[PDB]
Design an enzyme around this catalytic site. Structure first.
Site, PDB file in Angstrom:
ATOM      1  CE  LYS A 164      59.001  17.081   1.498  1.00  0.00           C
ATOM      2  NZ  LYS A 164      60.280  16.869   0.791  1.00  0.00           N
ATOM      3  CB  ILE A 173      57.624  26.748  -1.536  1.00  0.00           C
ATOM      4  CG1 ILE A 173      58.807  27.678  -1.243  1.00  0.00           C
ATOM      5  CG2 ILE A 173      56.810  27.260  -2.707  1.00  0.00           C
ATOM      6  CD1 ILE A 173      59.679  27.940  -2.462  1.00  0.00           C
ATOM      7  CB  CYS A 174      57.514  22.819   2.651  1.00  0.00           C
ATOM      8  SG  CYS A 174      58.172  22.339   4.268  1.00  0.00           S
ATOM      9  CG  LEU A 175      62.439  26.242   0.624  1.00  0.00           C
ATOM     10  CD1 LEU A 175      63.489  27.352   0.612  1.00  0.00           C
ATOM     11  CD2 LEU A 175      62.217  25.722  -0.785  1.00  0.00           C
TER      12      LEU A 175
END
Length: 166
Positions: free
Chosen positions: A109, A116-118
């Site tokens: 993620k 960061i991958c939300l």
């Protein structure tokens, strides 16, 4: 809405922002930064009161580059990560992309390069509240929930390890 109440429960003591300005917007941008700092400092004072003082941020002079640290406690050990982000030109309608560079390539993620991958929920939550949410809300609703899922997984998989500084 469960979503509307959950959001309110997280952000209700964070000062709301007002000004529609990004980095190129001169005196209106300086005013937006006053709202951003006033909102950030109240969120930090609330966190301290709740034994959850989980980050520090500073900016460049222009307020277009933010950097600092966040802390995450797991089984009473405190883990520290360096964080950074740029303010987009189309802020505050567009949300900033938080980077935790030391975790680049260390979990799923995360985008290539350390952003960061939300969840698909953060972006439309931000969009529905423009221009009332700022950097305090980005931390509370963006990075905060991300750490509460991902850091526990990094500890259990042994990807990160804790060492006490004394």
């Amino acid at each position: 809405s469960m979503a509307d109440e959950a959001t309110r429960r997280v952000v209700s003591e964070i000062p709301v922002l007002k000004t529609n300005a990004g980095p190129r917007d001169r005196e209106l941008w300086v005013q937006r930064l006053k709202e951003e700092y006033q909102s950030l400092i109240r969120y930090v004072e609330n966190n301290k009161n709740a034994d959850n003082d989980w980050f520090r941020l500073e900016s460049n002079k222009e307020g277009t580059r933010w950097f600092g640290k966040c802390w995450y406690i797991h089984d009473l050990l405190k883990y520290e990560f360096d964080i950074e982000f740029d303010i987009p030109i189309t802020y505050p309608t567009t949300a900033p992309e938080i980077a935790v560079p030391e975790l680049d390539g260390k979990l799923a993620k995360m985008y290539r390069g350390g952003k960061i991958c939300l969840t698909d929920h953060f972006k439309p939550l931000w969009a529905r509240n423009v221009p009332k949410f700022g950097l305090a809300h980005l931390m509370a609703l963006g990075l905060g929930p991300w750490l509460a899922v991902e850091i526990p997984d990094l500890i259990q998989k042994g990807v990160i390890h804790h060492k006490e500084k004394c």
